Symmetry: D2
Subunit: 354 residues, 4 copies
């Protein structure tokens, strides 16, 4: 047997209709008990399990999967989630780390990529799978993506040692800090533009073991609650004025992800560059990420944004860059130089170095 | 014969290396004269054409294509381009509208989607093709995408009546106000996520005539130089503070595209909503576009951002929404209500209104 | 309420492991009764339905869907299916046509595209949906695609009037005579390379009503049991000898789909062309389909295969071409010329004519 | 400088219109001389090169590329090409092997995948790139894919040591024995369904060095002219009769690729299985390939085709399987068992073992 903790934070997967809109819905364990694909009643009685503990039916062989449902309160639409919600989830995982062999987190899709990226950084030396999942359509609606997304997440966590924060949706397992949301309606909502999926499910399960990170059994789990909250993301647009950039970069901001054009470029107008220089003088750290879905930030143009206190984000998603910025700025007693060096490293599999 | 004006504004397609970086490069016509795929010298002499006028070799059939090169000064990396540059381009087109059957604009990739979207709005009642193109690699580097992009743009503009601002790249013709840049390195740099390409080139040329907009021969070209400059784009991120939104939405801003999560949703924390309400009270107009590449802003969640002075952008790209905002806010003597109604219409083929 | 007949012919969707291999598995209705997504017990009792009749939970809106399971015997791995099996299925549909509003057919994936194409031709003037579906993984294996494929097929048939033989898999509804199997392991096993899907399922259901064929309420269903069995498919390969083609095209063969290279081309070596000419003289009809997954057979090269008794298959799949060949050669009392004219028409939505 | 041999065998890339159809067109070198992208006249005079030798303009960096054009006569539409044409090409390569650093072969698209696969087997221990290319549209038509396909092939061969037979089209370099033709009209005519491209061209050139085969500098080039001609491909279709299979598998056939359904399955009707058994008794060797574009032949069904003298083709393209069959059956003095063992190995990167 392998035992999982299923953390239900909210999201459409569990929502219910109220006043003509979808809102978070409690009572997950109650529903899942009634579904044979999610709970094997015979086995529960035959083994006299507790009532909190659900049991998946068996595959041919491999261990049997048991799981406990922890329903957070209040449950959230993921558009309301922030760094503090992700820290709380990491702390749940830390508190129960020794009792379970893996974790599944049900989450709204709206900020799932940010949550996966944040958790990836918060869970240092992670040894066990932490699989986020969600749905475009609630599990209570007959035709939905929720059933198979949740089951897949549980079976991945229950059966494979993938020591990473991942996202499981639509038969694919992505590295959490590589994903971004690309479709607001289709079941294929997420893409990992600069990395293959870690796994695919079909007639068989194919895992990219060449990509999956190695378990560091020697090192203990270190959960970083020290994540810098004063970080932001700023998307450049043509003609963005220096005065607006000045206002945006005022204290107490400590870091910003600049989402630039193409291969990492912005306007070369001197008043704008002067505001970036001024911010650097104040100690602000800036990461240059491309607005483009695919590819990498590279130098080469006179408009390339590089310079004092600007670190290239290379091929990172903006979600990963913001999480990494929060993580690195939250580390105690480092110099600015050192913080910039850490930003330029691949710390969790989020960035490919050239 | 069909005659085209080729407007060279800058971009990597024409850049040269200086001090280890790419910068705009002058002298386009001089290079193109020397290239048989771009200039048929025999025909030029045989017909004694001017020296400014280049001539493409014959294509399979159809009219022969002649073109004149107008090289802007100064030439720009497109990351430095703004509404005033796009207005200037629209004015060049207006000035020479009667003399040519179509236009090709060489432009940097970095802001090409914005430029295409802006021009789409500025050129009201457009009757002739305006094809933007560019390249990931300069035409002076041997291994490049520039040659075939420029040629294709000229052949599309020269041979088909597609009365739209389009982007041509990597054998595809997109509707200009539907494109966005998706890849910073590959030759397939652009995507039209919520609309098919208007055309594809292979062994044959396939055109989606069911999509292409109809020529309104009755109506004259009206070029809008009255585009509102004080518009912005603001991308929401988890936990974005109300104080930062407040600072961003201060006067003199007149309109903003809010790029929200998923199907059009944002934090429901009251301090943030209050800043949006306050901005609306000051007369700011807001458009709600999704951060997601594909799909549409739709109501349905309690976190759906809707309310006073917020118009849904449905399936619009953010580049289109920003252009449409600039256009609509620049129109004289309209009420805030009327401006909002216009933002909710499909004015140039940039937005699909939902199905019943 | 709308009532469906669910015809279970076999396929991996229902298979069970025996002696270390998958083989067809009986007892479908028994399993489906125990699954709340497939059977609403409350509603069954509340309405006192029969035991053969299952009832789906309510969908968002629209009519409630009831269905009856017909389990064929013997059940087949679809690799063993032939024209006669497909004729039998068409006859089941014919026998029960008036009693149900639609049909779902559970079928193996291995020959599903051929089955869908054949049924498309056999069911002339079809007025109601006939939705084929299947699975890469059996429904009794916990982690599978079978649950959602079967449910979707039933909901599509139960809720929409799409008077076509279709294939439903992995959230997509394809025109049956436009599909081909492209992946032997992934859940996205099928593609419709030269036509959009007729429908897609996500948060919403999107249907291409401008593609869907119109119901011809005036005309009765005519089921063609007269399908020519002596048709074949021959894939050209570089250097294929004239002698082998000769042997392949011997009587009693009546028709062949030639799968040619690229835009419809073959070797121009005279000995091979002469065997094709000889076959034509004997009365064989040939259809030229491209080996390429996407695109169309078009003239333009000196190696283009065209000539006596060779009809261009344009953008047809090979499964559609073979079915259409069987159909057209089975029609009574037509000349060879007339049969060629019919092959050159779009008879069921399987072929796009140039324009 | 690096020197290439450009072998022009025919194909649409060079065709001309005659009597309303495209036919092979001579005079390639004459055309290429007049194109600045293909020939740097200044450099030619400055260096006083021969008139047969063309010179590419300088690329960004790396060695300068010179090439000689060998125009075969007669030129062929690739639909007319056979094992003997491919052997002749291999022999051209062998004859000139020491004089050049790489080879490009202009070829028709219709049978390019078969040609690439055949050459891959014929050129044992290949140390240098052999890049096939072609076009959907002739180079003499103004709007074409030919210019950039040919240039790219020359630059890839001229600048990288990829010791494989490859196909270059539409900015991608595929492993030759992994490709198949998927589109009869679009410029993206080819796909490598079970392997990534070896390289992609965009703003930069990205090479999958993890996939590219290693140069075996110890071993000499061995060109196999001993390729078995009596091999065939047979595509199964539903209800295919035993009598037709019997006729197809008659002597003198020595090997056949059976293209089966799905994961490698066929009818289990006894009369058909008996004909396969009979062919095996006669010494015929059979390879089981899937009709499906993507995936692999795997056991698992009762209808799985396996047995005496049947080797699984796993994930091979049919073009590769046929070439490998021709190669292995052409090897002198091997037992049937040894031949089957060789068919079950990955000999050139064409097959992924489980
Ligand atoms: N599909 C979803 O989960 C969307 C929802 N608004 C959320 O992010 O919580
Ligand atoms: N490839 C390009 O055109 C990028 C360049 N920085 C520009 O937009 O001008
Ligand atoms: N997935 C499947 O259904 C394959 C099976 N051999 C069949 O076609 O019956
Ligand atoms: N595009 C091409 O090259 C097709 C031509 N029939 C050939 O294979 O030679």
């Amino acid at each position: 047997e392998r035992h999982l903790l299923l953390i239900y934070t909210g999201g459409a997967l569990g929502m219910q209709s109220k006043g003509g809109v979808l809102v978070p819905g409690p009572g997950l364990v109650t529903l899942l008990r009634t579904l044979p694909m999610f709970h094997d009643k015979e086995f529960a009685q035959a083994q006299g399990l507790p009532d909190h503990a659900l049991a998946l039916p068996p595959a041919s062989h491999g261990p049997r999967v048991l799981y406990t449902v922890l329903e957070c309160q209040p449950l959230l639409d993921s558009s309301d989630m922030t760094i503090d919600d992700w820290i709380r989830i990491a702390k749940i995982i830390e508190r129960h780390y020794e009792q379970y062999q893996g974790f599944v987190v049900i989450h709204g899709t709206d900020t799932m990529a940010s949550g996966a990226s944040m958790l990836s950084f918060m869970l240092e030396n992670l040894h066990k799978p932490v699989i986020l999942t969600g749905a475009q359509v609630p599990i209570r609606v007959l035709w939905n993506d929720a059933r198979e997304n949740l089951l897949g997440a549980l079976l991945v966590a229950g059966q494979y040692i993938i020591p990473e924060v991942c996202l499981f949706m639509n038969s694919q397992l992505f590295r959490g800090n590589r994903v971004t949301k690309v479709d607001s309606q289709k079941f294929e909502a997420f893409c990992s533009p600069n990395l293959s999926p870690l796994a695919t499910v079909g007639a068989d399960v194919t895992i990219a073991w060449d990509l999956v990170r190695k378990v560091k059994w020697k090192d203990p789990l270190v959960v970083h609650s020290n994540m810098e909250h004063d970080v932001a993301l700023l998307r450049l647009y043509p003609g963005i004025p220096a005065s607006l950039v000045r206002a945006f970069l005022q204290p107490p901001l400590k870091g910003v992800v600049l989402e630039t054009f193409g291969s990492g470029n912005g306007p070369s107008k001197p008043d704008l560059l002067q505001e970036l220089r001024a911010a650097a003088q104040r100690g602000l750290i800036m990461v240059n990420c491309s607005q483009c879905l695919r590819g990498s930030v590279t130098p080469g143009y006179a408009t390339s944004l590089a310079g004092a206190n600007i670190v290239s984000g290379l091929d990172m998603t903006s979600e990963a860059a913001l999480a990494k910025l929060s993580y690195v700025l939250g580390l105690p007693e480092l110099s600015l130089e050192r913080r910039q060096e850490l930003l330029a490293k691949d710390l969790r599999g989020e960035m490919t170095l050239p």
